[PDB]
DNA sequence: TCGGATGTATATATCTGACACGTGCCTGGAGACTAGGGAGTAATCCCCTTGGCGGTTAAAACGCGGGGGACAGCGCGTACGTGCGTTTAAGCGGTGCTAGAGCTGTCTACGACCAATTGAGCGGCCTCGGCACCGGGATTCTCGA
DNA sequence: CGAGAATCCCGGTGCCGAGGCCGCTCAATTGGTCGTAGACAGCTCTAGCACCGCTTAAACGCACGTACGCGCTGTCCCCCGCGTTTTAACCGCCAAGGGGATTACTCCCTAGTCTCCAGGCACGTGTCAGATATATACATCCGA
């Protein structure tokens, strides 16, 4: 019944995700999401799969930068765990909305 | 009746003087385009490309690789001091991020 | 048969070989570098255009490119890039 | 009237004393000069504690006459020490550190007598009249053992007080210097002639130098750059035309050219490829020299001059890699 | 027409992005909050990209339109033109 | 006939030379067995740069004249 | 010996400074600061006094926006008082440096 | 009086209550002491960023003078656009 | 012959001056017909929105003369124009009167 | 003796169209002047980038419409779209 | 919870000097006519995109100890407020003043524009080799001891 | 610290993109012209620029004192780690199909030239909205 303590299984594969970097997002449900949220702006929008992969890369890096600054928010709050008030804080300071 | 030289060799360089001059005309940037301007601009791109591929080949040899993949360009950007400040508003696909561990999340 | 689209690929090849003799590039990274140089080109062109707008010219010269380089690049990057342009325009002059 | 210690011509002074500003003008200067005479061979502090006190009224010609006559009696006492079976003085000996700092400030006061028209100069060109303290130059001299062969070049000498510091410091044969802006070149001639008279008045050796009123574009300076190893200019406000031209001048030089810069010609961590064969950082080692480093200069941050030192072993090991 | 696809961004996927960003421990509301933020960001970009594609009088979304919308976002993703 | 060059790497290079060989011929040979671009390769022959319009025997370069690899840098 | 508690003399004149808005920065030492820090980039830089007032307005609003987001940092840290780690946090999240 | 027109110490000119005055503008109930030095450093770096740009504008316009237009275009390139002057 | 092509399009912002800036601005080879017309119309509508928000603060403060404080409160108290002009700064006005939650005792 | 072509009288006329019984300070006039040049240059550069991005050489009203729908927040953008639509319609009917 | 006591808007005489309104003029802005070339459309043709079937399967979803962070308060000392002398430098408002910024008259470099001329530069064809991948085995944390 | 749990790396196997080479444009490049744009003399004039009187608000320090920061302590609860059980992910295959690049082929829209012209911008004006002195009620705080 060997089981690691928490934080281990965090930091190992934090290392693997920071090194092995491909998409880390299942692009078929992602692509169905993009097709749905684009369908409401205009019906019958053909894509390029290259364009949807570009969207995946952009959203990936966007949420990762948001996560990093949000992690800085939680560290500055002296909290190991991230709560979504950190996210709202970071989006307020960056001035998205 | 002399033979045609080339302006990049006339500049003693590698980047296309003619293509940059054509894009400056077709870019609708000014009404007219100076003579030394695309030369200077091709030099600026030459230095930037050389500087980024220096660090790209550095990261590639650090991973002992020959075909430079986007990972090494990503690391070449965000590992350099001035280049990251240049390219803070810049995102590069297929690279992921730096090895970034917040040390307070590390255990004892 | 395809239409001769522009790219910077042979020049990235020349730069890549002249910095490292037996180093390659992935084609994704090739398109990345092409988009990068087009980005930097558009930035410097727009800034020189705004400068010529701000001083009422018609012909952007290497003076304006030098100034926009000095505006846009951080620090020692600019300090070497202007010298690269200095050497190159000097070689092109004669 | 303050003599050289070998009984030579006295440094004659006007009454009133030459007013340059309010903060540390020439009244305090003569007093500190004889405070460095207290820092010399001590046969005068016995009289300097007496009535040359810090309490005295402004424009004390009484303290001036006291100071001059006590110094004349001190030089007469040193002469009564000399004139037996004793040699008077070794000529070629050098001034010490804070002594030479006083000497350069002294040449600055007694030569630079109009900083106002020195401030009133022309627009953007390498005419930027920014100068360097005694101390970074002194530490740089400590960093670079300028021999009788390793001379100094200041293309764009300004007023060349740095060159005088190098001359009075090292064991060099000669030094160079040139200048483009007219008011500081005329005042640099004043600095030259006065400082030579000053080192006469101290009886101590200053090394030779050539300060000029001219340019650097000529092939004469190409040849002289190829001759002389150790070179500095405060290049920071020159523009990359001039600086790259000077790189091209430095290309033809000998190995180990201990060349200091202010703004560097190459990064301190420079690496070679095949592109930069035309460039200049390949054939030299680019290292940072130590600043003041207590420097409320022009910059509140320290100044941090930068040494270049010629080394083509980088490029020859690059040739070994080209074999590889 | 489609549905449920914002939850198609999965709990492991947000977890994988978090473990890339350096997140040690996640809370529960992080998932729905991140889905909402992603949805707002994607609407802002995709509306612009659709504006480009319709302005070209074309029906097919290119990579370049996404590139131009990210240029409006001050982000400017490379790899595509 | 065979002459030499004392490099600043100290490589006493074997030079397959003949009095019929030019200066550029030896420069291309130094490019061959040194990898060096011949744009700069001044060789100290009694304090003279050798010029490709002449040959070795035009300067009357004696054999075992151990020259010196000087780099008149013509990236320039 | 009438003396207010702290927080009063904060919030009154927080109201007055948010309403009565002119410069709230002594423009002569400010102007000497600007002349000094510009002097190092280039000697002998004549100004326009309008330009220096523009600099004062810009720096005023810049530091006030920094203060507001920094106050949000301290509130999110559950701290009433602002420490300069909040400032470093806010400049990191905004991505100045 | 006078010598070379050199300013050497003016960071204190952003004074202790004026920083406090701007913090009360920002709506701060209570301020630590290190905010003073930190804020002086931050403003100094920000002013370096703007003033390099405005000086560069003056050099390209080949003047000797900092106009308001130079400052406005400098802040325009900062991505922090200011109005009221051009 | 007074023509006033803005009023011929029913507007207030100048056709010829905006067309002058478009021809000077190097924005394309040619300037389209309805382009400065549509441009001046959108400018006029946005400026009308701004001044409509400024007059409200003029009512708020018993002022018959619009001030930078009026402009500041008008821009910041909007929702969408605040989003448009968040990277935009106005001199001489100040900020919103804004007190946080946990500072009030 | 010189010309600094402000847009002050336009602000006068629009202010008398929307709030006729209030004035403006010249400081506020310069603020609005910088505002108008900002909005103009942003829409103009947006349309110029669009013209280069779709390989065409003549920026027209559809291009400015796309530029507005990109650059402005959306509901106010659709308002300004309808305003300029009716205005260009009035230019066509009264050419 | 309200006496004392505050600096808090409200109200009103008295400047005043910034701000709305003629003015005049001239100087950039509005029609007539060309033209030619960007651009709109007719046609089409290939080609990438969508959609579906099927096979695998990694990967996602519940769940369940458990253990580590969140979090509530405390108390204690600390630093940060506050009125107040003091003290200190800052602003307002006079002076000249001059250095630098804006307008003008060439004019000559000096770059748009067309036309030979062709060769660098791109579409496409083997190819092969750095890399993808897999499999084995040495190497390195680890977490309950 | 020792069994386990990954993990690094070594090496063998193959493979599909890079990449060198092949043909063939058309865009660069030479060589011309031809207008014209900023460049430099050269000039007015105004606007920072010291300076100082001279008052003066305000900063600076300082004894107090107090609300806060935070180390700490239970506590609790909720995410984490790995396990078992689904489930579309994903990879390839077939097949249409419409949509995006193309040629072709006019066409009409705007650049440009010329000419009138009127309205925008100094300029100068009155002039009156508000700034400020002086008094006057009042949301809130000290505190019993
Ligand atoms: N090419 C050149 N030839 C001669 N002098 C030059 C020059 N370029 C610039 N200068 C002069 O170099 C001087 C530098 S000012 C330096 C001051 C002094 N050397 C010091 O630092 O202590 C300027 O006055 C300028 O006139």
TrEMBL record, chains A, G:
GO terms for cellular component: nucleosome; nucleus. Signal peptide: none annotated. Its main location: nucleus. One of its GO terms (molecular function) is DNA binding. It is found in: Chromosome; Nucleus. Residues 6-93 form the Core Histone H2A/H2B/H3 domain. It comes from the Eukaryota. Keywords: Acetylation, ADP-ribosylation, Chromosome, DNA-binding, Hydroxylation, Methylation, Nucleosome core, Nucleus, Ubl conjugation. The nucleosome is a histone octamer containing two molecules each of H2A, H2B, H3 and H4 assembled in one H3-H4 heterotetramer and two H2A-H2B heterodimers. The octamer wraps approximately 147 bp of DNA. Belongs to the histone H3 family. This is Histone H3. The chain holds residues 39 to 135 of 136 of the full protein.
TrEMBL record, chain B:
Residues 1-78 form the Core Histone H2A/H2B/H3 domain. GO terms for biological process: heterochromatin formation. Residues 81-108 form the Histone H2A C-terminal domain. Keywords: Acetylation, Chromosome, DNA-binding, Isopeptide bond, Nucleosome core, Nucleus, Phosphoprotein, Ubl conjugation. Residues 1-8 have a biased composition (Basic residues). One of its GO terms (cellular component) is nucleosome. GO terms for molecular function: DNA binding; protein heterodimerization activity; structural constituent of chromatin. It is found in: Chromosome; Nucleus. Belongs to the histone H2A family. Core component of nucleosome. Nucleosomes wrap and compact DNA into chromatin, limiting DNA accessibility to the cellular machineries which require DNA as a template. Histones thereby play a central role in transcription regulation, DNA repair, DNA replication and chromosomal stability. DNA accessibility is regulated via a complex set of post-translational modifications of histones, also called histone code, and nucleosome remodeling. The nucleosome is a histone octamer containing two molecules each of H2A, H2B, H3 and H4 assembled in one H3-H4 heterotetramer and two H2A-H2B heterodimers. The octamer wraps approximately 147 bp of DNA. This is Histone H2A. It comes from Xenopus laevis (African clawed frog).
